[PDB]
Ligand binder design. Structure first.
Ligand SMILES: CCN1CCN(C(=O)N[C@@H](C(=O)N[C@H](C(=O)O)[C@@H]2N[C@@H](C(=O)O)C(C)(C)S2)c2ccccc2)C(=O)C1=O
Length: 260
């Protein structure tokens, strides 16, 4: 198609590997580019961990208000919110919000511990029909993004379909779904990614991700003005291990998609 030739040209000029998945809920049509290839998820996997804790709250009505202790041993490489509460407590809701809106890695590790390990996060993916998502490690080793390594990876097609069920579908209860959407809309880290390639009047909720090998990711649910919402996943990785982040590639991919 026309958009696939532009995405192919964008990939060639960037020197990396680009994966795009678009789901238009107006007619369930999909636009895919390397949609079945595996990409390192990096911090984009935090949406699955937060959604799994939300599913547990459909039975445990007061789970989101449960206090969790933040000890100095719990801090990893990037904990902007958790460092403000060392030797104190954060609720599971505050931890889910920190992991999603600020990409706090300590909050991610606390959510994984609540689910009984990385196997508990992967279990929630299988429970809602995601046979591709796999979480194998905790923060921060899950971001190694080694080429060929299947660990901590998914495909663009699978993540776009799963993200649609979590935010627009009914994989979660009504109250939990609205909480997830509200958290995604209040993200603070995606101004230069998918949001930068879309019109300013469009409301966007997203989760970014970065890692080694220049891995630059962003997944988003998009609400156009007076139009059926969209779900767009953009994954990108590079050959050099110390390659810089390329958030402009994600913005350009979103612009190419939004032209159609
Ligand atoms: C060998 C172990 N090892 C290797 C891989 N790795 C990482 O990939 N860390 C990454 C990391 O911890 N990224 C954070 C994270 O994992 O949510 C935050 N997520 C990004 C995002 O949401 O867009 C951020 C840019 C807001 S930082 C990282 C990437 C670029 C610059 C600094 C840190 C590590 O730091 C690490 O411990």
């Amino acid at each position: 198609s026309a958009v696939q030739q532009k995405l192919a040209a964008l990939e060639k000029s960037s020197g990396g590997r680009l994966g795009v998945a678009l789901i238009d809920t107006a007619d369930n049509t999909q636009v895919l580019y390397r949609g079945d290839e595996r990409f390192p998820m990096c911090s984009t996997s935090k949406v699955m961990a937060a959604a799994a804790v939300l599913k547990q709250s459909e039975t445990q009505k007061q789970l989101l208000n449960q206090p969790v202790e933040i000890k100095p041993a719990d801090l990893v490489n990037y904990n902007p919110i958790a460092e403000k509460h060392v030797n104190g407590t954060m609720t599971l809701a505050e931890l889910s919000a920190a992991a999603l809106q600020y990409s706090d890695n300590t909050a991610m590790n606390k959510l994984i511990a609540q689910l009984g390990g990385p196997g508990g996060v992967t279990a929630f993916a299988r429970a809602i029909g995601d046979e591709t998502f796999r979480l194998d490690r905790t923060e921060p080793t899950l971001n190694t993004a080694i080429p060929g390594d299947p660990r901590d990876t998914t495909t663009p097609r699978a993540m776009a379909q799963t993200l649609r069920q979590l935010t627009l579908g009914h994989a979660l209860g009504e109250t939990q779904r609205a909480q997830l959407v509200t958290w995604l809309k209040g993200n603070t880290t995606g101004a230069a990614s998918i949001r930068a390639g879309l019109p300013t009047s469009w409301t966007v909720g997203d989760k970014t991700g970065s890692g080694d090998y220049g891995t630059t990711n962003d997944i988003a649910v998009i609400w156009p003005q007076g139009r059926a919402p969209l779900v767009l996943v953009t994954y990108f990785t590079q050959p050099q291990q110390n390659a810089e982040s390329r958030r402009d590639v994600l913005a350009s991919a979103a612009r190419i998609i939004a032209e159609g």
